[PDB]
Structures are given as C-alpha cells and as structure tokens.
Design a binder for this molecule. Structure first.
Ligand SMILES: C[C@H]1O[C@H](O[C@H]2[C@H](O)[C@@H](O)[C@@H](O[C@H]3[C@H](O)[C@@H](O)[C@@H](O)O[C@@H]3CO)O[C@@H]2CO)[C@H](O)[C@@H](O)[C@@H]1N[C@H]1C=C(CO)[C@@H](O)[C@H](O)[C@H]1O
Ligand SMILES: C[C@H]1O[C@H](O[C@H]2[C@H](O)[C@@H](O)[C@@H](O[C@H]3[C@H](O)[C@@H](O)[C@@H](O)O[C@@H]3CO)O[C@@H]2CO)[C@H](O)[C@@H](O)[C@@H]1N[C@H]1C=C(CO)[C@@H](O)[C@H](O)[C@H]1O
Ligand SMILES: [Ca+2]
Ligand SMILES: [Ca+2]
Lengths: 704, 705
C-alpha cells in the first residue's frame, strides 16, 4: 500500500499513500525526525464554462495505478556560480494516479536528495485532460511544531519587505505591522508568507520551503493554517481570479523541502538548480560573463539628483513633448559630462561597466500614473549623448549598462522590445537592468501571476537571441531558471540596499537573504555604501544605512552574485580608498565555496575561491549582537604562502553610532593559520587571501 | 451665467440650444424644423476616485461658462475610396469653456452643427488640476421626445453579430432576452442596453441616428435606455477592473453624433461621421491603397463541408512541438495547394483581384474556444500549403493572395508575432490581410471593445500602413470613420454577416437595416454572393438557408457599400449560374457619385452609383418580407447619351424561401428619359449595370427598355 523513497545516504525517508477517499498523502522524516507530517497533495480546477462538478476535483478519488523508481547521479557545470561543479544525485519515485470518476490520470514525481525533497505534478496528454484552468493548488507542508520562521508577507506584487523573525503562531498578530507601504502591493492573507521560507525547529532542524523552475505557471506563496501548523500552496491569481491556464502535457513547478541539522547545509544545497532544465543557450560560455559595476544611480535614489530632465511640465507625451525647449531642473545626473566622470572612475579601478538611469525621455511621469506609453527605450534626453558616451566608454574599456525601467507598462515594453534590444546592439550595450515599478498594465494583473511570469521569461529568451544579459528588478523572485538561461544574471525581487535610503533595512537583513531570497538565483543587492548617512547626499533624507563599512565589504562575499555593484558615488569611495581596495580586488565567480559559519538572523561567514585562481575571499556579516569568529584557514593549499589583507570593524565600531570605524591589516597566512575576528553590531569583515607569486611580496610582512 | 447659447445649422433647419442649469450641469437640446429631436439633456463625466465624497470624481456639474467661441468651417475633401469623389465638410461651431470652481479645473465641450446633424465632444486641456484621470462613467444624455420605433441590437462588450430587432423603445426591455442569441464571446450589460449606430423612426416623421465618431484612445460607447423617461445615456465598455478609460491631458473624447432628417435617404447620405475624423495621415495612400474584389477558400469551412484543420487525430497541438508531417490528413483540409490553384484560376478567368485562403497555417486544430495563448505563429504553413508555389502561380495569373490572420482572440500573442507576420506577408507578396478575434480576449478580463483593444486594433492598422498593407478586421470594434485617417483599413465585419446565413440565417430585412446602422462609420466585409442558398448542398448536416433570392445577392454589391467585396460562394456554384454571375464580374468597387433613390429602414433600399473615372452606373435594390415595387426614373444619367443596360431581377414567382434561384436577365438601351417598373420579391431585389455606349456597334440588335 504505502510507497517508500529513501535518500542516497538513508537519512531521509518519504512515505506516500492515498487515504480512504483517494487523497494523495506524503510525509518526510530526517534522521528519524518528522519534517513533514502527513500532508495532502492535489488541485481544484475551475468549473468549465456552462460530471461538470466532478471534473473540478483533481485532489482525491485517486488510485495508485503504477509506480516507477530510478536513481540519477550526474555532475554539471554552471556558466557562473558558487562552485565549479554541481552534483545532481537523487533517488526518484514517480506515482501514476488514476481517477476513476473522471477517467483521467496525473503523475506525482518525487526526487529525494541527501539534503531535501522535491516533488511536482505532471499532467499527461489524454482524452479526458487537455485544457484546464486551476482554481487553486493544494500542496500541503505540515509542520511538526511551532517553529521559528524568517518571513515576509505573502504578496502578489512586491517582496521589498523587511523580514520578521517569529514563531508560526505569532505570524497572524504580526502581519499588519510587517506589511509596510510600497508602490505596488497586494497582500492576500493574515497568515500568508512568501517563499523561499526559512525555519528553525526546536529539535535542531533547519527547514526551507520553496519552489523550482517556475515556468508557464503562477507564482506560489504559502498560506498558514496556524491551528494545525500546515503551510499550503497559494498561487497568484490573474485579473479574473483564476490561477493557471494549462494544456497537457504540462507540469507544475517543483515544490522543495530542504532540510538539515546544520544551517550551513541549507546554503550549500543545490536542489533548486538541480531541478531546473539544463542550459538551453548553446554558446553561453562565449558571451555570458560576470559584471562588476558602478553607476549614476545613488544620486536619484537618495534624492540628490533626479531621473527627470525638467520639472516645469505637469506631464509629458512622447513624440509631442520637445525637451530641447524645456528648462533643465539642474538635478539631472544622467548628463554626458557626469557620465564620463563615472566611466573614468570605473576604468581607473577595474570595473566592467557603468549603469546610467534617467537617460531616456519620459522620466517626468515614470511614477504611479499607470501610464501606458511611458517610455520608448531608445530616445535620449537632450543632455545624454548616446554615441559620444559609447565612443568614450569603449575607448576606456568600459561597457555601458542599459536601463529599461518599464514603470510596469508591459504591453508597451513588449511592443518596443525588439527595437530596444536592437538599439542596445547598435550602441554597444550588452547588459540591461530592467524594472517594473507600479501596478501592472494590463491592469488587473499582478507582478507574479502566470501572465507576467511568461513576460519575464519572454524578455530573457529574446535577450538571449541578441546576446544580451538581463538584470530584472521587481520581477518574480528566482527559482533556478538561470541554469536554463544563464543570461539572467540578476533580479532584485527582494528588499535591497535602495531601502537603506528609504528608512533602512533591518540590521539582520543580510544574515537572512542567503537562506531565503538567494535560493533560486543571485540578487543585485547593490552593496558598497561607505557614507551610510544619506543626509550627506540629500539634506532632506535622514535615512541611515544599517551597516558598518566593513560589513559592506563583506557583502561582496556573503551576498553571492555574478553581478556586483559598488553603489556609492565616486567621491565617497575616494574618501576611503584604502577600504575600497577590497571591492576592487574581490572576484565575482567561484571555483569553490566553503560555508564556515551560518545562523539565520545572526551571522553568515563564507570563504570562496576565485575561479581560475589560487586566491580566496572571505566575508562575514552579523546582526545586532555582532559575532566573534574563530577562523581556521585549513581550506588553503598545504605548503603555500598567502598575502592576506583583513578589513575589519575597529574596536567599538557600531552600525548606528560608529559605522565608518575600520582597520586594515596585511600579513601572511598558510593553511595552519588561525584568526580571531569580531564583527560589531551590524558589522562584519572581509579578507582577501592571495597566493604569493613572488618573494618580493611577503617582504616586511609577518604571519597573522 | 451667460444666457443660453444658440447654434444653428447652415440652412437654419436645426437649432441647438446650450445652457448650464441651476446646479451647474451642462445641458443641450436640439430641434429640427421646429420639432424636438433631443429634449434637454445633460453632459458630463464621473471620474474614478484617486469617510466622505471626493469632489474630484465630479466632472458633471458645478460648472459655469467661462468663455465661448463660434466659427464656421466649409471645405471639401476627397477620400481615397468611398461612395462619392468629394465630401463637403460644412458646419457652424460653438465651443464652450466650462470652469468648475470646486475643483479649480476646466473642460471644453465643442459642438458642430451640420444641415443633417449635430456632433459634440468633450475636450480636457492640460492644466494644473487635470492631468491623469480615469473615467468611471461618461454621462452623455440623449433625451427622446417620444416612444420611437428603433432598429437595434443588444448592448454588448464583445459581439455585434446579432440580428436586428424592430420595436418601440418601450418594448426593448421585454425583447432583450430573446434578442440575445448564442455567440462565442458575448457580454450583454443591460436589459435596455443597445449598441450605437442606433436607428430610430419617430411618430412625427423623423429619422434619428445616434452614434459616435473617431473612437480613438477611448472605450467604445454603447447606449443605455431609461425606458421610463425615454432617455439614452452613454455607457462605455469597462476594462478588466471595471474602469472606463485612462486619460491624460490634453485629450478628447470621441464625437457623439445625432443625425436627423425627415427623409430616410438623407441619413444614408450624411457624411458627418467621416467629416468629424482627422484628415488622412498616410501621405502616399493613393499609391498603394486600392479596392479589392475577391473570392476565397472560405465557404467550405463556414458550412462544414471542409475544415481549417489539417488533421483530426490530435487532442491538442503545441506549435514547435507537434510535427504535422507525421499526422494523418483528415481529407477535408481545403487550404491545399492544388485546391488553392483552382480558385486562383477562377479568379483570373473572371477578373477578380485576390483570393483569400483560411486554414493555411499551423494551429487550427485548437483555434476555437480554448482561451489558448500561443495559438498561432502566423507564418508556418501546413504540410499541404506551398507558400512560394502559390505566390509564383498567383503572380503568373495576375492575382494577389489575401493573408488570413485569425488570432483566436489571443492578442498579446498576435502582437508578439506581428512584425514577423507582416514581414512574412511582404516577403511572400501578400498586400492585404483579413484578421479575426474569435473567442474571449486574452489578456483575460478584457472585452473586445474596451479602450485596451481599441488601441490594439489601431496599432495593428498603423503598423500595417508602415508595411503598405491593407487590413480587413473581423470581430474588431465597429467603425467610426477612422478610415478617413487610415485609408488602409478597408474593412471590418463587426456586425452579423453572411456567415450567419449558414448558422441558421439572418433576418430577411437584415440588409435593409445595416446601411442605416453598421455602415455609418465604415464599410463592412459582408461577403455577399451566395447563389446556392441551401447550405445542405455544401454539407448535408447543415440545414441552414440563406434568406435571400439570387437577384438580391447581386443587389448587395451596390446596396452594401464596400471597397472590399467578396463573391463568397464556391466556383462550382457560380459556374451553375454564370449568366447571373456576370453582374458580380462587372460591378465596380469605388464611386464618383452615389444617388440614394429609395430608402426605408427594415423595408427597402435602392441605390444608384457611378463607377469612379467612368460614365457607367450600377443600381441595386434590397427588400424585406413585403418585397418592394420600384418606379425607377433614370434622369441621373447624362442627357443625349446612350447606355447598354442589363437588368438582373427576381422572377415574378421568386421567393427567398420557396423559389430563391428564379431570376431574369434583360439587356437593352437606357437614356435619361427611360423609366422602369421593377418588383423585388420577398427577401428579394434587383441589380442593374448601365454602361455608356462607346461604340455604336455595342448597341447593335438592342432595343430600348
Ligand atoms: C525607486 C524605487 O521607488 C519605489 O520605492 C518607494 C518605496 O517602496 C516606498 O515605501 C517609499 O519609501 C519611503 C518610505 O516609506 C518613507 O518612510 C521614507 O523613508 O521615505 C521613503 C522614500 O520616499 O517611497 C519609495 C520611492 O518612491 C519602488 O517601490 C522601488 O521598487 C523603486 N526601486 C526600483 C526603481 C528604479 C528606477 O528605474 C531603480 O533605481 C532601482 O534600482 C529599482 O530597484
Ligand atoms: C467561424 C465563426 O465561428 C463563430 O460562429 C459561431 C456562432 O457565433 C454561434 O452562435 C454558433 O452558430 C450556430 C447556431 O447558434 C445554431 O443554432 C446552428 O444554426 O448552428 C450554428 C453553427 O454551429 O456556432 C458558430 C460556429 O462556431 C464566431 O462567433 C464567428 O464570429 C466566426 N466567424 C469569423 C471567424 C473566421 C475564422 O478565422 C472566418 O471564417 C469568418 O470570416 C469570421 O467572421
Ligand atoms: Ca526596487
Ligand atoms: Ca465573425
């Protein structure tokens, strides 16, 4: 009767069966500890526009018709990632479920790894199941206790919320305050949360609930039954309230449960990526590449500068408004002379590209007007010389990063997309930062519905045809699709550094993101703010970045991404050029990654080996209690000497009272070295460890 | 303030009186020859709100006249194609600037009064307190002076493919249920809602038409009747969230029109709709836009004889995955090279310009009602359709192929494929395309006539113009004169066409109403020309019968104006009646002059037109269930000239139901002194070709008629 699937190491066991009413039921244990209590699986379908009642049932009345098992064990290499190779090793169980009352069958495929379980529903092409609409997916995740969760409010339009750390039973009472103001937001439940969801159990376990390969389907959130402690899939509705237009053969994305008694193993898990389809960009390795950049950006985010060219018009209309006849507001940062200054800085310090926002016509009306024809993505303002900027950047060996804020007007963006990408190709742009700020147009749709998920992928696939890399802000959070389309080098899709200018992010924010948001794909977090007091940029902005300078440096290692921005303005980096050296030195791609220390909400310490080098980089980020590390460099090569530079919080450093106090020490390290470092409140540290290649490097240096 | 204003038509017959009432509501009234046409009616709009009412939502009262400007316009222009060579645009104008103290904002209401009607629109100037706004409801009233007889179809956000109903305004409510027949995509909105291009006949001898003009960047207007006070009010089409228009100043609403006369023929002669549209924007239009007479592989599938699909063995298909080469032909796929060539041969042998082919591309297996997103790619042909060979062959025969772009209402999908689709047309010699939008709109939640889709339809036409492509769009929002601005929009169905004669039939009087309603604003691709009226001969399972005689079908080439005319039957049926087919072969598609000889909505329409750049005339008469007797006087012909006339008429015992294929053909001479008595049978009519004699040899052996 019951089906049992075991992980390769025998530590995890998944038991499957249908109850007495034919409802698919599964459960999972880890080291003999209950991780997932008996939980049901199934979906309810929309009644077909006027048997008709029984057809809506795709949740019970099932009989196990057939079962197939198999084992997979292959290694693959991502174009860019946290390590050179990833091993995909799992035991699989596929259950064919027949539903007599509707004469149709579905398949539930289970893949069990040593670090977690993944499952998905498969809908075979058959006589009685072709086109169908999903009313709701009912995938349950029954918890064995009132765990501690690290969560953000379930929302169909934004994920730019600070995390909350509380018991599952406390979520309901905390939801109201957890939902802060945002340009576009649609919370759905007093107990709804987003994925990836991170939890810590009283019996020493760490559990992460998420999904993988979100394609041709609506984004999954989780709704908590806080009486029975059961999380259940809650999909994003379209403009009519429906949750998915399907056509067999088709599959739902995978649902994942990553678990371990060691928090570091959650970060090390590659289940999400392993469950995605293999790379579909044949020549990816020839053009896809990591990018370290700076940009004309923080000016506008802080309010010092503006995206708009003029402030004298009540509104603008592309093709009618003649900007050449308008009065400059004197705050437009995207002007040729200023852009060249950034290009100079980028070239002088080894950066790959320079982002510039506010370069094109239309910014006057970019915010909250639900404007359809808001941008054309190709017409520059009078003070932005596309060709001259291109000429200069190219001569300096710098690439300009295109900016495509859509103001959430999606049909408008698609209509202009080919011309926009061609414009990029014709003017030397091979990477683009897109955005979707505001309520979606078509009006009625949400940012994470099936409709928009299709758009985001459409944009990435078309970009691949033009050999363009994409960094999409406000898009649906990643679920590992980067394996399939490596040109998607980034997404924000979470609360980033920009909010440190909008009131600030919680001190423990970066000690949570790697356990949640980063599972499924890198984030364009835009770290590197040295002048943490925003009033120095804009007197009217009293927001303060909750970090020390040393912790900002650490983020280049603790916030993984092949796309890394040094977000502050050149002048501020010039004020602390000694600390800036770490940002200049740090790599963007890795051959190896060692998670040294990890505890969600408290601290994260990671060491990574730069790809194709013998150099290592270390970073530690900590919460309000700071953190003391006892580092052991036994991961370094035996018999080798290393030049180590330690960027750490000075004594009494503090994110609030003394954020710019840091020390820099240079010495020698070997695999026998041990170091004690203390991360302050909202602080951390960064270490560059370069293999000695010449005696004339250790001169005057002593062992640390 | 500001004593009521008076606006008069050039001929003094119409008078529009405007005044803001005691509560600040803009009010207008209209009289024709001292008879009330429009009783005091208010104008204004309610806006969407951006513990108490927000005054900003109020754009209907609390106004005061701040300024007024009058002007007269009198200019003549020439359409690329039309019912006559030149159109005179002559009106007296009154523009009223209305200031709203409570919101510190102003709007303008512009009135244009012609000898045959009134047009008005709202204008929203760019200003400090009015920039971006959303319309909740437009409140344009049209107060009737009585319980008039109306020729209407159910107000609907998704379809206009309904038969007309003739009833008193007070009877609409009780007839609505039965007037709403089954359709693939329909959204009725009121028990007393009707579609615009509403025709009425009053007890005191007036004919009134209510409609709109220049429907651009705005939601389609329908009319909702208050049958207790007989007041019609603008009812716009909602978007997926229920809103009725996203506006940004400066902007204007489309024009609202009231066409009136005591002579029904003058309703047909009115050019107010076209005159209110913006002038042509296609500079080189004359060099590529041209009328098209065509036939097509079409009726086969409409009747069920053939299929659009290539195979019947699949539960569904997925473009790019389904390999049609490995599928079994269903043996009913009409869109195959050899068959298409037969049509091309026929088109060339009889002087047609183009051949339409439907079911040529992959995907038709799932085209109907699945709300399928990636339903077509508009470029990949089925295994049995050789695009290049057909192009070479058609070119060799002097024929052009008409592209078919059924979208199955999946709009984002069509837009994503549009440039490649139009480029494919250009690369393969297709200069015209018949598009379609069958099914509920995708994005799901939108309706066929909302602001969103109206934008799409125009987007498709404007892009087509860049490719020098002409468009004929089925299921799109009904026309409002935009063809003046974009002459490449040579057609729309957007009403119940001949296809329904195969779906149970159209009412016998249908074609005696369309010219008074649907045709106001633009031509219709009605696809006339069915000679074998019994569909069971095409498909035994189809017992539908076309409600027409053969002679009436010929008449439609003159009474259903269009620069795009199809001869819808299959070649074999035209072969059976080649003598009658001669009229379809001879009739012109564009005209220098049009004379409306007889006209009564629901009963009969008789029209005479002079072919452009010729001295030849064509006449047609279409009648309802009571038939019609005409006393034709050919004084519109040129004095002293001889004409070779061929009369195609119903036999004395003809009847659409019992004897539809009984006709007579007479050839003789006509002069401006000639007179003919003709009788159109029940559901019948007649057609006449009148060619000026160019060589005395042509009149040899012929006598005067
Ligand atoms: C540019 C940015 O705009 C939006 O951010 C808004 C926040 O969501 C609001 O909550 C609000 O923040 C205010 C605080 O609530 C308030 O307590 C005080 O601290 O002042 C804050 C600023 O007024 O206002 C924010 C600005 O409107 C939007 O939600 C966010 O996603 C946008 N960021 C993206 C857009 C662009 C432009 O193309 C890029 O520069 C960024 O990289 C994107 O991430
Ligand atoms: C092709 C055509 O399909 C749709 O027409 C459907 C009618 O709207 C329905 O009411 C229904 O008619 C049936 C009668 O109700 C029933 O009493 C009996 O008489 O049988 C009739 C036929 O079954 O079914 C019709 C067929 O599904 C749709 O509404 C209509 O707009 C469509 N016409 C356009 C589509 C194409 C294809 O690309 C072109 O061939 C035509 O030119 C278009 O006008
Ligand atoms: Ca953002
Ligand atoms: Ca149709």
């Amino acid at each position: 009767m019951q089906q049992k699937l075991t992980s390769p190491d025998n530590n995890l066991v998944m038991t499957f069966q249908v109850d007495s009413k034919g409802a698919p039921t599964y459960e999972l244990t880890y080291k003999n500890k209950v991780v997932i209590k008996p939980s049901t699986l199934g979906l309810e379908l929309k009644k077909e526009d006027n048997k008709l009642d029984s057809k809506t049932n795709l949740y019970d009345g099932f009989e196990v018709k057939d079962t197939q098992t198999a084992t997979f064990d292959e290694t693959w290499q991502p174009v860019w990632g946290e390590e050179k190779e990833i091993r995909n090793h799992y035991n699989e169980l596929a259950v064919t479920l027949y539903q007599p009352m509707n004469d149709r069958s579905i398949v539930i495929r289970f893949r069990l790894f040593n670090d977690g379980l993944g499952f998905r529903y498969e809908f075979p092409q058959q006589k009685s199941l072709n086109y169908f609409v999903i009313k709701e997916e009912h995938s349950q995740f029954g918890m064995n206790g009132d765990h501690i969760a690290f969560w953000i409010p379930g929302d169909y339009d934004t994920q730019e919320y600070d995390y909350t750390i509380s018991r599952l039973s406390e979520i309901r009472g905390l939801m109201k305050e957890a939902i802060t103001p945002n340009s576009s937001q649609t919370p759905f439940s007093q107990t709804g949360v987003q994925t990836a969801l991170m939890m810590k159990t009283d019996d020493g376990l760490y559990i992460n609930l998420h999904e993988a390969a979100l394609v041709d389907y609506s984004c999954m959130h989780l709704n908590l039954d806080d009486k029975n402690m059961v999380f259940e899939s809650w999909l994003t509705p379209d403009a009519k309230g429906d949750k998915g237009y399907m056509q067999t053969p088709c599959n739902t994305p995978w649902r994942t449960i990553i678990v371990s008694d060691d928090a570091r193993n959650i970060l090390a898990s590659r289940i999400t990526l392993n469950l995605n389809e293999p790379c579909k960009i044949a020549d990816a390795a020839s053009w896809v590449k990591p990018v370290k950049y700076i940009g004309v950006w923080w000016d506008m985010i802080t309010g010092k500068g503006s995206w708009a060219y003029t402030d004298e018009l009540t509104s603008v209309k592309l093709g009618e408004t003649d900007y050449s006849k308008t009065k400059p507001n004197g705050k437009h940062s995207a002007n040729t002379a200023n852009v060249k200054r950034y290009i100079d800085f980028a070239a002088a310090h080894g950066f790959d590209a320079v982002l510039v926002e506010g370069w094109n016509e239309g910014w006057e009306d970019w915010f909250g007007n639900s404007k359809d024809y808001v941008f054309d993505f190709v017409t520059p303002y009078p003070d932005f010389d596309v060709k001259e900027i291109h000429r200069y950047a190219a001569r300096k060996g710098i690439k300009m990063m295109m900016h495509h804020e859509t103001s959430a007007s999606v049909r408008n963006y698609e209509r202009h997309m080919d011309k926009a990408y061609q414009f990029m190709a014709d003017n030397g742009y091979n990477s683009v930062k897109s955005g979707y700020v505001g309520n979606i147009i078509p009006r009625g749709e949400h940012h994470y519905g099936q409709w928009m998920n299709n758009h985001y992928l459409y944009a990435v696939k078309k970009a691949a045809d033009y050999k363009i890399m994409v960094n999409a802000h406000e898009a649906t959070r990643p679920t590992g699709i980067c394996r399939t389309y490596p040109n998607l080098i980034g997404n924000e899709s979470a609360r980033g550094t920009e909010y440190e200018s909008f009131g600030g992010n919680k001190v423990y924010h970066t000690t949570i993101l790697p356990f949640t948001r980063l599972v499924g794909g890198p984030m364009d977090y835009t770290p590197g703010i040295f002048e943490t007091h925003c009033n120095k940029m804009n007197p009217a902005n009293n927001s303060q970045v909750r970090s020390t300078i040393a912790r900002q440096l650490a983020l280049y290692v603790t916030m993984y991404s092949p796309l890394q921005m040094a977000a502050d303005i050149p002048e501020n980096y010039e004020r602390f050029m000694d600390a800036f050296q770490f940002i200049k030195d740090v790599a963007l791609d890795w051959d190896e990654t060692n998670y040294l220390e990890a505890e969600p909400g408290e601290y994260i310490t990671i060491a990574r080996k730069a790809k194709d080098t013998d150099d290592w980089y270390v970073g530690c980020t900590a919460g309000e209690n700071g953190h003391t590390s006892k580092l052991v460099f036994d991961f370094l090569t035996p018999g080798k000497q290393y030049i180590a530079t330690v960027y750490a919080d000075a004594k009494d450093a503090d994110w609030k009272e003394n954020p710019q106090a840091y020390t820099i020490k240079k010495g020698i390290l070997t695999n026998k070295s041990k170091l004690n470092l203390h991360a302050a409140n909202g602080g951390g540290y960064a270490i560059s460890i370069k293999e000695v290649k010449d005696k004339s490097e250790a001169k005057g240096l002593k062992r640390l």
